[PDB]
Amino acid sequence: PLPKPVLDTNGKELNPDSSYRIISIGRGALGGDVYLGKSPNSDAPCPDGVFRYNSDVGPSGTPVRFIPLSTNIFEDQLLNIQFNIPTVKLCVSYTIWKVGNLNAYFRTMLLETGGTIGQADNSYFKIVKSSKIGYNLLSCPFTSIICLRCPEDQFCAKVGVVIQNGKRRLALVNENPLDVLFQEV
Template sequence: MMTTKCLFILCLCLVPYVVFSSTFTSQNPIDLPSAKSVPVLDTTGKEVDPRWSYRMVYTKRGPYGGDIYLDYSPGSTAPCPDGVFRYGQVGPKGTPVRMITPSHFGPGVYVDQEINIQFVISNVEKCGSYTIWKVGPYDSEERVSFLETGQQDSKSCFKIVKSPRLLGYELITCDGALVGTMGNRVALVNNFSLDFNFEKVED
């Protein structure tokens, strides 16, 4: 009889745990870094922290590419800069960015983790809604989708992945499209990937 009572009490104690676990694994999954998670590193070898600002600099630091920066898209009528560009040469400093991660369980940014990218600007009150990177509409004339900035939505999801050729990183959309450059504009392309490293912006 005592054994039966103990088992009954044990079952009652386990019910809240089972319900709690089921809720967060099936309906609201938590994005926790796993033991296999690989942190994204900056140019000094330190882990990239979403609380800090970084410049996305060209991996080779050579004559064929430079920093990523924010500017007006060609033909744009937006009240604020709304396009993602890359300088054609090393020298000019790019616009700082921050990574927005879906997890609040640590400061790290991880390879192959779903993130948003946000330009860090001074006039947030006026142009704060033109800072989140996103994939723009398909340009039928250029036959490509350029990256633009705006408010967060389903087209503003990206992943940082290791470059198969260089020591730095590449960027893909969350559905696997490669982000690269077409001229000095950042776009979804099949080649000319956006090879880059993160350079921390010092205060």
């Protein structure tokens, strides 16, 4: 059952101290890197939404880092994902990835910032290798609650995209999970 490290674009294992852009290998329209953005009509003082660009010719994605629970980043393990940007203090809260409350309109939960690090709230994610090529993010929210007969009593869902206000919003999906790669800086 030996823990396998997640790996970057260069093949080198993922490192807590490093920074990575979460990139697609999608060509053209199918490409687009993950970035921090303002949410459609957000009350939030900072940008709090989690998006990807629309085409590969879009700007480079926002860097993020990974904070595991141990000292290493393995596949299939709870961890936190935090945009790594310099910032004004009000905003430092709003870099940590989080899964939002059920959005009735979309019938699922969107990814946003202002999560917390090291706690069993909405801020937990997993990395897993894609059924195709590259990696998939899962959200395992509510690990503080027993998921009856679920694997390890946890509820997890694959992360995908929904189109909110014509952008690409990262949300929980059931199929077509976002395939990603991690490209060190």
